[PDB]
């Protein structure tokens, strides 16, 4: 049952046309679906007329048997009228009876045979139509999801930051399902429903227009009632959805921060707020769903009123001789069929609006400007000499972040960047990976420029270590092998041993099969960083950059890691960013950087010689202030 409240569309018809053109390749399949639906609906609507003819023959025989034999119809009617029962004569007048003759079962049988054959064909065409419709829908959905994928992998790295906490997530996961529902409905149920209405109206017009009036008058009444119900329930759906989201947010905060809630004595207050929010969401759900379910009985009442009127007036007409009994049986079946789509017209309207507004969002996502086309050059970093030349960068036009710096990382040397929070270290190394584009500078790796280089081939040989560690919901072994998926189960373990992951792996019950998530599994943050280090070192890099790699690791395991990886990072440059002074020690080219610029550079001894910044910083780090 539909419960999405409503959405606003910038342009309904343009988005609808684009969505229709999306399923354009399947033009032949779509045409075959439409034609099969039309044929099946025509054959299914013509059958009750055949049944009406059969029962008409039955009635003629049955009530012509009782009449005296020999006399003809128009004189038997006169004789009955002279008997005083004029209404029965009027009934006999509009009929095909031959007095004295019984029911001809041969004609009835050979008419029911035609009806059965038509019903077989109708029940055989609909199945084929549905089977073809499923294939068409699946093909279009596969194409749409594939191109959505491609667009996601082509989008700039700044689009995902502007979007608000899961907008992109809810734009591709649960927003394509709405498109699927709308597309699979608008050709399988809405089309049949409008064709049903049209064909039924045509046939009942061929039967009796006056009776058609009484059952077509209800369409405006049923539509008015349906739209009144939806208009009055619109404020309820929004309230229900908002309360559900609010309760979910409270539950997530209570569960994630459960330790804080328990420790600070807010357990009995969180329970009270839950007991006051769940009660509200229950009311807002009951009220929203009562009106939602009220639609079907409301329209069924109008349909039954039409049925009563049709039955009474048709009985009066047949008793008068205007139409035959079979023609009123067929009309009863026709009005019963016609009442059906009016019940869920609200359902189609709701599931069409919610889903065309989804296609609008998906198309807007697919129409956003993507990254510039990377020039294929197959970066060939041999030594690792990095050079920044007057590099300037601003996240947004206006306030700048990095202002005209120039560093020279010689091959083998391990440059160490330090500075206060917000200096832009992470931005400085992100510029090196071409996550963003340098505004008015130049980054050269081993002489060659970085702009005229295949971006994938550049990022595949740097092995960067995040500042904010990220792990997908899988096993530790899978997380480590995420670097090089084509590595056997003898290099992954070697890298884990090098990163000392295989020192606490032997502590868990199931060592390498431990399911670990990014939201606080059985692994602490310090041990979590080791998994990232192992993953980065598994995919053999040519120059390492580590942004706060060992922030939560003690200065006794990081020393072992450095000793173990001394051979690996022996002839490769490394940009180490850390707020901890004990990690940048024994590393030439210490860059103290503030406000985006570089205040001073040089080795540890030179920096200590010229008291200032670094000096003051190292005095503050140790005992003093």
């Amino acid at each position: 049952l539909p419960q999405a409240p409503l959405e606003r569309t910038r342009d309904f018809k343009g988005s609808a046309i684009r969505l229709a053109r999306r399923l354009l390749p399947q033009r032949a399949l779509t045409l075959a679906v439409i034609l099969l639906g039309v044929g099946g609906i025509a054959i299914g609507v013509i059958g009750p007329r055949i049944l009406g003819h059969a029962t008409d023959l039955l009635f003629n025989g049955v009530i012509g048997r009782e009449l005296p034999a020999g006399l003809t119809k128009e004189q038997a009617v006169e004789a009955a009228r002279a008997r005083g029962d004029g209404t029965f004569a009027d009934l006999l007048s509009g009929m095909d009876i031959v007095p004295g003759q019984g029911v001809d079962f041969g004609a009835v049988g050979r008419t029911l045979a035609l009806a059965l054959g038509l019903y077989l064909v109708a029940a055989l065409l609909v199945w084929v139509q549905a089977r073809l419709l499923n294939v068409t829908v699946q093909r279009t959905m596969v194409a749409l999801r594939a191109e959505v994928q491609e667009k996601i992998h082509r989008l700039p790295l700044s689009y995902f930051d502007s979007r608000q906490r899961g907008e992109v997530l809810s734009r591709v996961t649960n927003d394509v399902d709405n498109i699927q529902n709308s597309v699979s409905m608008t050709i399988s149920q809405l089309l049949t429903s409008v064709l049903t209405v049209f064909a039924v109206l045509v046939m009942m017009l061929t039967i009796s227009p006056l009776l058609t009036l009484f059952t077509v008058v209800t369409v405006p009444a049923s539509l008015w009632v349906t739209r009144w119900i939806t208009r009055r329930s619109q404020p309820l759906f929004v309230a229900q959805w908002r309360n559900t989201g609010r309760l979910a947010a409270h539950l997530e905060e209570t569960y994630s921060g459960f330790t804080i809630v328990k420790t600070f004595g807010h357990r009995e207050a969180a329970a009270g707020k839950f007991a006051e929010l769940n009660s509200e969401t229950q009311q807002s759900s009951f009220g929203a769903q009562f009106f939602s379910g009220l639609v079907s009985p409301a329209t069924m009442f109008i349909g039954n009123l039409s049925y009563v009127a049709v039955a009474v007036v048709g009985g009066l007409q047949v008793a008068t001789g205007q139409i035959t009994l079979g023609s009123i049986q067929a009309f009863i079946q026709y009005v019963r069929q016609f009442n059906q789509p009016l019940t869920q017209v609200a359902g189609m309207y709701n599931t069409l609006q919610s889903g065309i507004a989804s296609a609008e969002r998906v198309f807007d996502l697919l129409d956003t400007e993507e990254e510039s086309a990377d020039s294929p050059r197959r970066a060939d970093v041999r030594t690792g000499r990095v050079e920044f030349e007057h590099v300037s960068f601003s996240y947004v036009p206006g306030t700048p972040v990095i202002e005209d710096l120039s560093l020279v990382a010689e091959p083998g040397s391990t440059v160490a960047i330090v500075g206060p929070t917000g200096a832009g270290k992470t931005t400085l190394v992100n510029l090196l990976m071409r996550f963003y584009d340098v505004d008015s500078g130049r980054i050269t790796i081993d002489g060659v420029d970085i702009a005229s280089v295949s971006r994938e081939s550049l990022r595949a040989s740097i092995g960067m270590v995040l500042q904010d560690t990220w792990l997908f919901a899988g096993t530790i072994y899978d997380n480590i092998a995420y670097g090089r998926p084509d590595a056997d189960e003898d290099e992954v373990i070697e890298a884990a041993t090098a990163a000392y992951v295989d020192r606490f792996v032997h502590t868990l019950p199931n060592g390498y099969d431990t399911r670990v998530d990014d939201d606080g599994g059985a692994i602490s943050a310090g041990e979590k960083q080791l998994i990232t280090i192992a993953r980065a070192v598994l995919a053999r890099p040519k120059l390492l950059v580590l942004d706060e790699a060992t922030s939560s690791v003690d200065t006794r395991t990081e020393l072992l890691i450095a000793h173990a990886m001394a051979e690996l990072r022996r002839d490769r440059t490394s940009f180490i960013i850390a707020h901890r002074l004990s990690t940048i020690r024994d590393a030439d080219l210490i860059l103290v950087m503030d406000s985006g610029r570089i205040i001073e550079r040089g080795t540890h001894e030179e920096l200590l010689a010229r008291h200032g910044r670094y000096w003051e910083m190292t005095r503050v780090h140790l005992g003093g202030i």
Binding site: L112, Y119, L251, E253, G257, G293
Partner: protein, 574 residues
């Protein structure tokens, strides 16, 4: 399955007279809907057939009364069916949340914070929708299929065998379809969320994906899942495409056979010709209701696995409880003592801690040091009794923690965990967790200490500046700096810092650790320290090392005696 029925029988019992009222209202409504064809047949055979024209117009009143009863008996049914289902969902959600809130750290971590939210929010909605479209759509079949046959007996018993032949055959032909459709439907459901989680992982770790240049294989692994999902959907649709046409074919064949075998009897006079319309409508309504009820039957297992998860959540018994009649020490002053403690996490064969034993007197600072994975956070949790020591003793102010009011221990323990979590709202609301009634002059001082004052005072809203869902608007080092402020505002007798000083630059770290060393001059402070230069001022130092302690003393004595402390000092010398 089995767990689902248990749930139902327990959590719908408060609403039995609502279900029993819906069951009667929908019986009356279905009977009224099936009775309209009966009075239509009465119009045909007692009116038109006999020529009476007043009989038709007088039976129109009966028809009108029946259709007026049918709408009220349906709008009364949809009201109570909703008031019962929403109430059942509300009660189940409340029970699940209440049970979860009693879990300790270990039980909560067994399921996970993310998985528990789904358990308490979506798997209750699935059972609620099952209840709703069972009390409104499933039960339509057992009354329709029975009352229709009953009215057929009441109308023409000599021909009602058609309903006893057609209903079972349609039921069998639909059961054979659904028994094949259910497993592939479950597989498609288990693939939909799989591709959803694939997309979620791709979007969350987009920076990781681009940094490792995994796009060419990420596309392959997404395509191999999209194609599999499409194939499963096609397989499940080629079965679903048989549900409607088979029902329509059965209806039409039954109609044809009805006309034939009805003409056979009407020619002999055993039945009036008017009953054909009534039987046609009976067949249509009954065989449509059966198909519509079997449509909902597809998702039983989807609501059964959810019920199994909810039952496994509800069946877990908490271990850390509040002792009966606990000792109540007025004005609990911090004085900790650990005697031969050992945790030995579930998942045994390696106890995390072993024979830990030391003492922290009141007003003295004790700093615990050790490599990653040593168990410092486990010791901190044991101090505040997030867990319970299995084979040791942990006594605060002489009295053991295990027999003590847990809330009183909570109230004066000043915990600053390693994680760092800020609830939604304003900074003032987050700081009010420490003291429920804190003045702005006191909040600014507490804020000021943690050196967090001059990044919220520079905000236009000041103390009322908004905070994200989990403090995600902060950068890290501001969130866990506000975490320090929200505990220093408590002014507790015990401070328990769990290394919340990471992600802080040198100046801010020094400022914070020098300012909080003043406000905590007279307080039992246990700080998980990493930098040796910040341990000289500590009154006592503990040398946890991958299990037990390997040294106890001050800075100089531990440097002289303990070799691991000497290794730490040498390695972070310069």
């Amino acid at each position: 399955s089995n767990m689902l029925w248990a749930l139902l029988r327990q959590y719908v019992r408060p609403y039995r007279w609502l279900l029993a009222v819906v069951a009667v209202l929908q019986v009356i409504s279905n009977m009224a809907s099936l009775y309209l064809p009966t009075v239509n047949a009465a119009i045909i055979d007692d009116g038109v057939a006999k020529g009476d024209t007043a009989r038709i117009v007088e039976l129109g009143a009966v028809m009108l009364g029946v259709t007026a009863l049918q709408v009220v008996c349906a709008v009364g049914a949809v009201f109570f069916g909703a008031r019962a289902a929403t109430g059942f969902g509300h009660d189940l959600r409340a029970a699940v949340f209440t049970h979860v809130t009693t879990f300790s750290a270990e039980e909560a971590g067994r399921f996970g914070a993310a998985s528990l939210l789904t358990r308490t929010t979506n798997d209750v909605g699935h059972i609620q929708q099952l209840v709703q479209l069972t009390v409104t759509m499933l039960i339509t079949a057992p009354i329709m299929s029975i009352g229709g046959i009953f009215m057929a007996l009441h109308q023409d018993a000599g021909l009602s065998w058609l309903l006893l032949v057609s209903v079972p055959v349609l039921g069998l032909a639909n059961y054979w379809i659904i028994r094949h459709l259910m497993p592939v439907f479950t597989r498609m459901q288990s693939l939909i969320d799989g591709i959803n989680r694939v997309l979620r992982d791709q979007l969350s770790g987009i920076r990781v994906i681009r940094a490792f240049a995994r796009e060419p294989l990420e596309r392959v692994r997404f395509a191999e899942a999209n194609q599999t999902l499409s194939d499963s959907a096609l397989e499940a649709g080629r079965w679903q495409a048989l549900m409607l046409p088979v029902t329509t074919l059965v209806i039409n064949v039954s109609s044809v056979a009805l006309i034939w075998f009805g003409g056979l009897r009407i020619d002999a006079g055993q039945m009036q010709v008017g009953s054909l319309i009534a039987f046609l409508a009976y067949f249509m309504q009954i065989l449509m209701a059966v198909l519509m009820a079997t449509f909902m039957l597809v998702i039983f297992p989807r609501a059964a696995v959810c019920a199994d998860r909810i039952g496994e959540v509800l069946s877990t018994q908490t271990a850390i409880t509040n002792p009966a009649d606990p000792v109540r020490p007025a004005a609990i002053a911090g004085d900790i003592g650990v005697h031969d403690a050992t945790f030995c996490y579930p998942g045994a064969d390696r106890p995390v801690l072993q024979d830990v034993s030391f003492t922290v007197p009141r007003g003295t600072t004790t700093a615990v040091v050790g490599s990653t994975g040593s168990g410092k956070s486990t010791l901190i949790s044991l101090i505040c009794r997030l867990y319970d020591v299995t084979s040791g003793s942990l006594r605060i102010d002489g009295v053991d923690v295990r027999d003590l009011d847990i809330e009183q221990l909570w109230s004066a323990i000043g915990l600053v965990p390693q994680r760092g979590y800020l609830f939604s709202g304003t900074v003032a609301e987050n700081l009010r967790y420490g003291r429920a009634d804190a003045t702005d002059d006191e909040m600014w001082e507490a804020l000021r200490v943690a050196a967090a004052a001059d990044f919220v005072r520079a905000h236009p809203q000041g103390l009322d500046m908004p905070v994200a869902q989990g403090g995600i608007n902060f950068s890290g080092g501001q969130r866990q700096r506000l975490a320090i402020a929200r505990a220093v505002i408590r002014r507790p007798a015990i401070y328990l810092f769990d290394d919340a000083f990471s992600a802080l630059d040198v100046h801010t770290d020094a400022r914070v650790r020098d300012a909080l060393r003043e406000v905590a001059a007279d307080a039992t402070v246990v700080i998980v320290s990493q930098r040796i230069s910040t341990v000289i001022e500590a009154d006592q130092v503990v040398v946890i090392d991958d299990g037990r302690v390997v040294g106890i003393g001050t800075h100089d004595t531990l440097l002289a005696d303990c070799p691991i402390y000497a290794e730490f000092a040498e390695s972070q010398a310069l």
